[PDB]
Ligand binder design. Structure first.
Ligand SMILES: [Mg+2]
Length: 134
DNA sequence: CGCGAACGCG
DNA sequence: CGCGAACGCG
C-alpha cells in the first residue's frame, strides 16, 4: 500500500489519558492546518480520535472533496465505520462536553452519507502522521 | 491509562 | 459443560 498525498490527516494532542483533548486536521502533502478543535477539558484519546475523523468527514463533505482521511487510530476508525463510539468513559458533569461532542458526532454519522475513504496511517512504514502534535 | 481482541455461576 | 462476565499496544 502506498501513501495518498492528496489527503487529509488527523491526530489528537492529549495531556493525559483521560485528560485534555485537542485535535487537528492537516493537508497530508503541505501540512496546512485545515481545522482545529481547541482543548476539551477532559476526554479519552480514543474519543478525540473519533471526533477528529468525523470533523474531517464533515469538513470534506462541505467542500465536496473526494480526498481520503488518514488516522493512526485503528480504534477510532472502527468506531466511525460502526457509527458507534464504544467508549467506557464515565458520563458526569466533568465529562459532559466530550460526551456531547461524541454523541453529536454519532448523530451526524447516523444521519448522513459520505464518500471519503477512511484509511489507516501506517507509522511503522511512513513515519509520523502529518497532524502529530510532537 | 483506554481500547479491541483474545472465569465462575447457573 | 457453556454463555456471558471478567494481552498488546499506542
Ligand atoms: Mg493519536
Amino acid at each position: 500500500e502506498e501513501i495518498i498525498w492528496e489527503s487529509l490527516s488527523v491526530d489528537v494532542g492529549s495531556q493525559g489519558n483521560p485528560g485534555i483533548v485537542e485535535y487537528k486536521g492537516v493537508d497530508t502533502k503541505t501540512g496546512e492546518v485545515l481545522f482545529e478543535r481547541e482543548p476539551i477539558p477532559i476526554g479519552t484519546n480514543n474519543m478525540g480520535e473519533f471526533l477528529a475523523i468525523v470533523h474531517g468527514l464533515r469538513y470534506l463533505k462541505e467542500r465536496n472533496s473526494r480526498k481520503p482521511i488518514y488516522s493512526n487510530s485503528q480504534t477510532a476508525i472502527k468506531w466511525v465505520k460502526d457509527k458507534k463510539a464504544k467508549s467506557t468513559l464515565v458520563r458526569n458533569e466533568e465529562t459532559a462536553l466530550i460526551w456531547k461532542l461524541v454523541d453529536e458526532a454519532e448523530e451526524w454519522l447516523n444521519t448522513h452519507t459520505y464518500e471519503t475513504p477512511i484509511l489507516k496511517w501506517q507509522t511503522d512504514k511512513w513515519g509520523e502522521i502529518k497532524a502529530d502534535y510532537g
